[PDB]
């Protein structure tokens, strides 16, 4: 929030050069000075016969915004043979990517083309150049004897690059192996060491490289983006890389080990085509010494308020944990088609609060699509998702969008002050802009009125002009200011005081300053350094009783303060900033002495009490709970009286009830000033004597877990009186209960079977389902609806297996869904009938031969279920009653359950039992018409 946007340093290259496409700081160890490096990938150069070879520029910060090209390669193309170029430098996009570490700087031409040494080709292998003072070496890992699209021919190495702690280059080649992509890493020492200009394919010794893979992985673009950071516990920076076309354009982010090119973690996008992986960053955002991953997916479409897709871009934020499981959250852009996740630039600690910060760019955003950069501050929790500052693009398009924010670099305090600065690149207008961080200061304002309660009769000090005396009191403000980094010692503050703030608005001015006789007063104050809480006093008097009529309202003393801008800045006008989460004013208040008895001191008697409206809070979900509170003052008037109901912050506050005239509708607010967890309600400023209040405060307690047996609220009234200023604290238990509306239900998919059974005949020893009869599915479902979960249950199925000695419904196979095992007390499928390819009327286990299936159910949570799929065949033979013809049979199975255990082992429980029966009715439908005495035949 402290980037100076009034006077940032502005740099520019030649038009059409894409000056600004890549940016970085240059911090050489050989010099006290620092520069900034701007990549200009379309820049024309003096290289013989080469159009738009591109270049990189070293830019002076030491005043003079002039930039000089770094002379990496002044030569044109080499020759395979005479009038037969070995390489093609024109249009190579050299300067498309730029990174430096200490004296070393790496620049790449990812569109550098290369004739093979076998066939006459034009293959974009890409190349880089590493400089150190005057020494320059070419590093072109992909330019090897692996020479086509199936090899590294179309590698475009140098598309993205990075230096590791230690010293070693990570390089991205998104075209290697049919555009699978490639990461290659090399020791900086090695590159310079093994460099030989007479060899075009140099083999570095400790090279690490990702290998070719299967053809599904083609066109993934590994190494499109790149970032470095430690993830496998400790040791060296490991390799992070965006793979934007991975997983069917879902996109992925791969992380490889730094020691070898071993895979550690993958990330995957939620939305195809969104370019998850366009940009990646690693930086410890929560100050726990663990690098955290950020992934840009700039074409993401979140869902609008209407419900409709809209391209806003999204950034993923994965917090690393010592375990290994990242703790991820999402961050959506704010404008449609402003490409929010385009560039993620770690800033280090931009404001020096103790946590790192980060800048995310939406380079086609802002009114007139000039480009925006959002800056987000880190915190112990994670990144603060509400951006603390918005850097606005300044230059309008010539034709192509200016693309401000398309590239960025931070983390380098380019001037003296101990705050990192930021480079933003705007390549569409051939500009780059350095924003430099302002110093932050923390002020601690004090205010006090030594005589708090004002007695109108006590007229001690005399009014200056007149010859009479007045009831006056003392007002004293004070300022202690301090801040890290380079900033001045003499800090000027414009302080302003106001008597009776909530009254000047139209009404009478009940208190004035002694010498001015005005409610308003100023003071040019000049504190310094840090600690020296510099003070200044003023005596203010109170008007004569003879007509300000109000004597009950408090007299609020208001103090505000502002810094002076230019009297504070350094030499080049870098004005300091106040800490954004620090209010620039404070309030205290006096009360006219009224009642309080003969002793002139007000002694209240505060009492608070509550009762259980609803005695139960059922575990496992959110639960509405309102408690009635009776706050009464039986003593004298209590000043600034307010109820402090400290709630167990496994609970939230909805509001005071306004559904009942029996309860008072108090003024309340929730807060947590470190460790506290409370709603604070106003009981009247002077809560007068005998004023009993009744109020309802509604809450919702979420408590899903098996914590304490109850949940506790503590409440007490408190006031600003010198004596008897609080009530006793009063606890209030609320009993956690268990409730699990568990139900069982079942079905028979063919609920009936009509017995003219088509294409059936008797088989002595049958195989197959066809030969036995139709399939009858009996699905049984136990489901826990109830809020509370259960940890164990038992399921019992009774299956009508045989009637007399005839095999009714024959079970082929049963299946299970959910936390449940089952056992049949009888061998299922005794006859090995295999195929799959997927009391006359009622016959139950009472009158039939019973097959039992017991099941052991695990933990079913709220809204979960266990399911038994029993696939059976109807044994037709039987129903062709050789006894005599037929009759309608209702084949009934039944399933019961009993819940035996709960995870809330310290709380009243109760076994839950119920059952269902599902039925399969076998009838004929087609049956004899009238006929007298004859009999049947087969």
Ligand X SMILES: *[C@@H]1O[C@H](CO)[C@@H](O[C@@H]2O[C@H](CO)[C@@H](O)[C@H](O)[C@H]2NC(C)=O)[C@H](O)[C@H]1NC(C)=O
Ligand Y SMILES: *[C@@H]1O[C@H](CO)[C@@H](O)[C@H](O)[C@H]1NC(C)=O
Ligand Z SMILES: *[C@@H]1O[C@H](CO)[C@@H](O[C@@H]2O[C@H](CO)[C@@H](O[C@@H]3O[C@H](CO[C@H]4O[C@H](CO)[C@@H](O[C@H]5O[C@H](CO)[C@@H](O)[C@H](O)[C@@H]5O)[C@H](O)[C@@H]4O)[C@@H](O)[C@H](O[C@H]4O[C@H](CO)[C@@H](O)[C@H](O)[C@@H]4O)[C@@H]3O)[C@H](O)[C@H]2NC(C)=O)[C@H](O)[C@H]1NC(C)=O
Ligand U SMILES: *[C@@H]1O[C@H](CO)[C@@H](O[C@@H]2O[C@H](CO)[C@@H](O[C@@H]3O[C@H](CO)[C@@H](O)[C@H](O)[C@@H]3O)[C@H](O)[C@H]2NC(C)=O)[C@H](O)[C@H]1NC(C)=O
Ligand V SMILES: *[C@@H]1O[C@H](CO)[C@@H](O[C@@H]2O[C@H](CO)[C@@H](O[C@@H]3O[C@H](CO[C@H]4O[C@H](CO)[C@@H](O)[C@H](O)[C@@H]4O)[C@@H](O)[C@H](O[C@H]4O[C@H](CO)[C@@H](O)[C@H](O)[C@@H]4O)[C@@H]3O)[C@H](O)[C@H]2NC(C)=O)[C@H](O)[C@H]1NC(C)=O
> Which of Ca ion, ligand Z, ligand V, none does residue 123 bind (CB under 5 to 8 Å by kind)?
none
* DSSP H or E segment with residue 40: strand 35-40
Nearer to ligand X, 665 or 745 (CB): 745
Interior/surface letters 69-108, b for 16+ CB within 10 angstroms, e for the rest:
bbebbeebbeeeeeeebebbbbbbbbbbbbbbbeebbbbb
For residues 273 and 39, give the distance between their C-alpha atoms in angstroms, rounded to a whole number. 28
8-state DSSP, 637? P
> Which of other proteins, Ca ion, ligand U, none does residue 357 bind (CB under 5 to 8 Å by kind)?
Ca ion
Nearer to ligand Z, 138 or 219 (CB): 219
For residues 314 and 365, give the distance between their C-alpha atoms in angstroms, rounded to a whole number. 14
Nearer to ligand Y, 381 or 522 (CB): 522
- Residues 603 to 622: which contact ligand U by CB under 6 A? 622
> Which of ligand Z, ligand X, Ca ion, none does residue 262 bind (CB under 5 to 8 Å by kind)?
ligand X
Q: Does position 415 bind Ca ion by CB under 5 A?
A: yes
> Which of ligand Z, Ca ion, ligand V, none does residue 265 bind (CB under 5 to 8 Å by kind)?
ligand Z
- Residues 568 to 587: which contact ligand V by CB under 6 A? none
Q: Does position 430 bind ligand V by CB under 6 A?
A: no
Dig out the tokens for 586 from the structure: 């404070």
- Residues 564 to 583: which contact ligand X by CB under 6 A? 583
Please give the angle made by the CA atoms of 570, 376 and 578, to the nearest 5 degrees. 35
- As beta bridge partners, residue 163 has 169
How does DSSP assign 189-237, residue by residue? HHHHHH--TT-SS---TT-EEPPP--GGG-S--BTSEEEEE--SSSSS-
Q: Does position 262 bind ligand Z by CB under 6 A?
A: no
Cα–Cα separations (whole angstroms), residue 708 to 395, 615, 711, 734:
61, 16, 7, 11
Minimum distance between the CB of residue 919 and ligand U, rounded to whole angstroms? 5
Using the contact rule CB under 5 A, the part of the chain among 223-231, 270-278, 389-397, 772-780 near Ca ion is 223-231
Minimum distance between the CB of residue 222 and ligand Y, rounded to whole angstroms? 20
Q: Report yes or no: 250 and 196 within 8 Å, Cβ to Cβ.
A: no
Q: Report yes or no: 369 and 403 within 8 Å, Cβ to Cβ.
A: no
CB atoms within 10 A of CB 186: 20
CB atoms within 10 A of CB 262: 13
Binding residues for Ca(2+): 230, 232, 234, 236, 238, 284, 286, 288, 290, 292, 349, 351, 353, 355, 357, 413, 415, 417, 419, 421
| Residue among 890, 896, 913, 923 that touches ligand X (CB under 6 A) | 913
> Which of other proteins, ligand Y, Ca ion, none does residue 144 bind (CB under 5 to 8 Å by kind)?
none
For residues 127 and 395, give the distance between their C-alpha atoms in angstroms, rounded to a whole number. 32
* DSSP H or E segment with residue 878: helix 876-879
Q: Report yes or no: 389 and 378 within 8 Å, Cβ to Cβ.
A: no
User: Measuring CA to CA, which residue among 547, 415, 434, 549 is closest to residue 487?
Assistant: 415
| Residue among 266, 660, 672, 906 that touches ligand Z (CB under 6 A) | 266
Nearer to Ca ion, 596 or 739 (CB): 596
Nearer to ligand X, 472 or 590 (CB): 472
Dig out the tokens for 341 from the structure: 């996740």
Q: After which residues is the chain broken (C to N over 2.5 A)?
A: 838
> Which of other proteins, ligand Y, ligand Z, none does residue 932 bind (CB under 5 to 8 Å by kind)?
none
Q: Report yes or no: 701 and 622 within 8 Å, Cβ to Cβ.
A: yes
> Which of ligand Z, ligand U, other proteins, none does residue 622 bind (CB under 5 to 8 Å by kind)?
ligand U
- Residues 342 to 381: which contact ligand X by CB under 6 A? none
User: Measuring CA to CA, which residue among 887, 878, 890 is closest to residue 925?
Assistant: 887
Using the contact rule CB under 5 A, the part of the chain among 488-496, 598-606, 638-646, 703-711 near Ca ion is 598-606
- Residues 226 to 265: which contact ligand X by CB under 6 A? 257, 259-260, 262
Q: Report yes or no: 350 and 331 within 8 Å, Cβ to Cβ.
A: no
User: By three-state DSSP, how is residue 249 classified?
Assistant: helix
Minimum distance between the CB of residue 816 and other proteins, rounded to whole angstroms? 12
Nearer to ligand U, 79 or 751 (CB): 751
**732 phi and psi, to 5 degrees?**
-155, 100
**504 phi and psi, to 5 degrees?**
-50, -35
- Residues 914 to 933: which contact ligand X by CB under 6 A? 914
| Residue among 216, 396, 535, 654 that touches ligand U (CB under 6 A) | 654
Kindly list the residues in this chain that would bind ligand Y in the complex (CB under 6 A): 248, 522, 524
- Residues 579 to 608: which contact ligand X by CB under 6 A? 583-585
| Residue among 265, 513, 790, 801 that touches ligand Z (CB under 6 A) | 265
Q: Report yes or no: 906 and 709 within 8 Å, Cβ to Cβ.
A: yes
Nearer to ligand X, 60 or 560 (CB): 560
For residues 285 and 318, give the distance between their C-alpha atoms in angstroms, rounded to a whole number. 10
Q: Which residue is nearest to ligand Y (CB)?
A: 524
Q: Report yes or no: 795 and 855 within 8 Å, Cβ to Cβ.
A: yes
569 contacts: CB under 8 Å, gap ≥ 6: 575, 576
Nearer to ligand U, 464 or 624 (CB): 624
Q: Does position 472 bind ligand X by CB under 6 A?
A: yes
Minimum distance between the CB of residue 602 and ligand X, rounded to whole angstroms? 15
> Which of Ca ion, ligand Z, ligand V, none does residue 51 bind (CB under 5 to 8 Å by kind)?
ligand V
> Which of ligand Z, Ca ion, other proteins, none does residue 112 bind (CB under 5 to 8 Å by kind)?
none
Minimum distance between the CB of residue 430 and ligand V, rounded to whole angstroms? 9
Site string for Ca ion, 332-371 (x = CB under 5 A): -----------------x-x-x-x-x--------------
> Which of ligand V, ligand Y, Ca ion, none does residue 107 bind (CB under 5 to 8 Å by kind)?
none
| Residue among 14, 583, 624, 908 that touches ligand U (CB under 6 A) | 624
- As beta bridge partners, residue 651 has 701
Q: How many residues bind ligand U (CB under 6 A)?
A: 10
**534 phi and psi, to 5 degrees?**
-75, 130
Nearer to ligand X, 263 or 660 (CB): 263
For residues 435 and 792, give the distance between their C-alpha atoms in angstroms, rounded to a whole number. 62
Q: Report yes or no: 161 and 56 within 8 Å, Cβ to Cβ.
A: no
CA distance from start to end of the chain: 95
For residues 619 and 784, give the distance between their C-alpha atoms in angstroms, rounded to a whole number. 14
Minimum distance between the CB of residue 472 and ligand X, rounded to whole angstroms? 5
Site string for ligand Z, 120-149 (x = CB under 6 A): ------------------------------
Site string for ligand Z, 202-221 (x = CB under 6 A): -----------xx--x----
For residues 647 and 626, give the distance between their C-alpha atoms in angstroms, rounded to a whole number. 12
Minimum distance between the CB of residue 325 and Ca ion, rounded to whole angstroms? 13
Q: Does position 192 bind ligand Z by CB under 6 A?
A: no
Minimum distance between the CB of residue 45 and ligand V, rounded to whole angstroms? 9
Minimum distance between the CB of residue 126 and other proteins, rounded to whole angstroms? 10
Minimum distance between the CB of residue 559 and ligand Y, rounded to whole angstroms? 16
Q: Report yes or no: 185 and 168 within 8 Å, Cβ to Cβ.
A: yes
- Residues at the contact surface with ligand V, assessed by CB under 6 A: 14, 16-17, 42-44, 51-52
Residue numbers of the site for ligand X (CB under 6 A)? 257, 259-260, 262, 450-451, 458, 460-461, 472, 560, 583-585, 913-914
């Amino acid at each position: 929030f402290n980037l100076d946007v009034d006077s940032p340093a502005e740099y520019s290259g030649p038009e059409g050069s894409y000056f600004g496409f890549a940016v970085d700081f240059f911090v050489p160890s050989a010099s006290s000075r620092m520069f900034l490096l701007v990549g200009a990938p379309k820049a024309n150069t003096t290289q013989p016969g080469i159009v738009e070879g591109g270049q990189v520029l070293k830019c002076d910060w030491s005043s003079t915004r002039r930039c000089q090209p770094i002379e990496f390669d002044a030569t044109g193309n080499r020759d395979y043979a005479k009038d037969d170029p070995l390489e093609f430098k024109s249009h190579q996009w050299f300067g498309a990517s730029v990174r430096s570490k200490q004296d070393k700087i790496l620049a790449c031409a990812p569109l550098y083309h290369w004739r093979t040494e076998m066939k006459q080709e034009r293959e974009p292998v890409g190349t880089c150049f590493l400089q150190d003072g005057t020494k320059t070496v070419e590093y072109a890992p992909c330019r090897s004897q692996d020479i086509d699209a199936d090899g590294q021919g179309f590698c475009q190495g140098g598309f993205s690059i990075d230096f590791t702690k230690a010293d070693r280059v990570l390089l991205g080649g998104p075209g290697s192996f049919y555009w699978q992509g490639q990461l290659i890493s090399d020791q900086v020492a090695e590159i310079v060491s093994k460099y030989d200009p007479n060899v075009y394919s140099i083999k570095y010794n400790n090279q690490l490289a990702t290998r070719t893979a299967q053809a599904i992985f083609d066109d993934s673009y590994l190494g499109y983006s790149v970032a470095v950071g430690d993830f496998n516990g400790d040791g060296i920076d490991d390799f992070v890389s965006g793979v934007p076309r991975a997983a069917r354009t879902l996109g992925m982010v791969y992380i490889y080990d730094g020691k070898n090119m071993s895979s550690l973690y993958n990330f995957t996008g939620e939305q195809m085509a969104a370019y998850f992986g366009f940009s990646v960053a690693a930086t410890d955002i929560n100050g726990d010494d663990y690098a955290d991953v950020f992934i840009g997916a700039p074409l993401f479409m979140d869902r609008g308020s209407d419900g409709k897709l809209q391209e806003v871009g999204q950034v993923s934020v994965s917090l690393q944990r010592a375990s290994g499981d990242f703790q991820t959250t999402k961050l959506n852009g704010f404008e449609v088609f402003a490409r929010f996740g385009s560039a993620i630039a770690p800033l280090g600690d931009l404001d020096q609060d103790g946590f790192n910060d980060i800048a995310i760019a939406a380079p086609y955003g802002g009114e007139d699509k000039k480009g925006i950069v959002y800056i987000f501050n880190g915190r112990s929790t994670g990144l603060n998702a509400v951006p603390s500052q918005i850097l606005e693009g300044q230059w309008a398009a010539r034709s192509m969008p200016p693309s401000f924010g398309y590239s960025m670099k931070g983390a380098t305090d380019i001037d003296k002050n101990g705050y990192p600065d930021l480079i933003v690149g705007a390549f569409g207008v051939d500009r780059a802009i350095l924003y430099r961080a302002r110093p932050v200061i923390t002020v601690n304002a004090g205010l006090e009125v030594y005589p708090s309660i004002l007695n109108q009769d006590n007229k001690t000090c005399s009014l200056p002009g007149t010859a009479l005396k007045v009831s006056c009191f003392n007002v004293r403000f004070c300022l202690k200011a301090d801040g890290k980094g380079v900033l001045p010692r003499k800090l000027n503050f414009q302080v302003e005081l106001l008597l009776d703030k909530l009254k000047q608005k139209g009404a009478i001015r009940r208190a004035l300053f002694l010498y001015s006789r005005s409610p308003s007063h100023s003071k040019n104050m000049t504190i310094s350094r840090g600690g020296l809480m510099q003070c200044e006093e003023l005596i203010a008097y109170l008007r004569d009783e003879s007509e300000f009529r109000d004597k009950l309202t408090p007299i609020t003393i208001f103090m505000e303060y502002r810094l002076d801008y230019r009297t504070a800045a350094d030499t080049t006008g870098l004005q300091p900033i106040l800490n954004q989460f620090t209010p620039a004013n404070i309030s205290r208040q006096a009360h006219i002495l009224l009642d309080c008895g003969e002793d002139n001191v007000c002694k209240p008697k505060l009492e608070v009490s509550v009762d259980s409206d609803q005695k139960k809070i059922y575990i496992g979900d959110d639960n509405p709970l309102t408690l009635i509170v009776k706050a009464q003052n039986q003593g004298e008037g209590a000043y600034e009286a307010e109820l402090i109901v400290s709630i167990p912050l496994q609970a939230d506050f909805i509001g005071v009830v306004r559904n009942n005239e029996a309860l008072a509708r108090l003024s309340c607010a929730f807060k947590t000033e470190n460790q506290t967890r409370q709603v604070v309600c106003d009981l009247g400023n002077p809560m007068k004597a005998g004023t009993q209040l009744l109020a309802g405060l509604r809450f919702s307690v979420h408590q899903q877990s098996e914590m304490d047996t109850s949940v506790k609220f503590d409440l007490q009234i408190q006031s600003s009186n010198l004596f008897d200023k609080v009530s006793p604290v009063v606890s209030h238990k609320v009993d956690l209960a268990v409730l699990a509306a568990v139900e069982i239900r079942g079905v028979s998919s063919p609920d009936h079977v009509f017995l003219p059974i088509p294409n059936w005949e008797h088989k002595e020893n049958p195989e197959t389902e066809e030969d036995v009869g139709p399939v009858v599915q009996h699905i049984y479902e136990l489901r826990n609806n109830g809020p509370s979960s259960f940890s164990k249950a038992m399921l019992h199925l009774q299956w009508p297996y045989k009637y007399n000695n005839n095999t009714l419904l024959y079970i082929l196979h049963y299946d299970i869904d959910g936390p449940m095992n089952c056992t049949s007390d009888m061998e299922i499928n005794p006859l090995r009938i295999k195929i799959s390819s997927l009391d006359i009327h009622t016959l139950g286990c009472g009158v039939a031969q019973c097959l039992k299936i017991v099941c052991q159910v695990g933990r079913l949570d709220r809204g979960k279920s266990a399911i038994l799929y029993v696939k059976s065949l109807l044994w037709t033979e039987t129903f062709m009653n050789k006894e005599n013809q037929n009759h309608s049979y209702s084949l009934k199975s039944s399933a019961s359950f009993n819940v035996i255990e709960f995870p809330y082992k310290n709380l009243p429980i109760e076994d839950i039992t119920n059952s269902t029966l599902v039925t399969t009715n076998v009838t004929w439908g087609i049956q004899p018409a009238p006929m007298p005495v004859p009999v049947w035949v087969i």
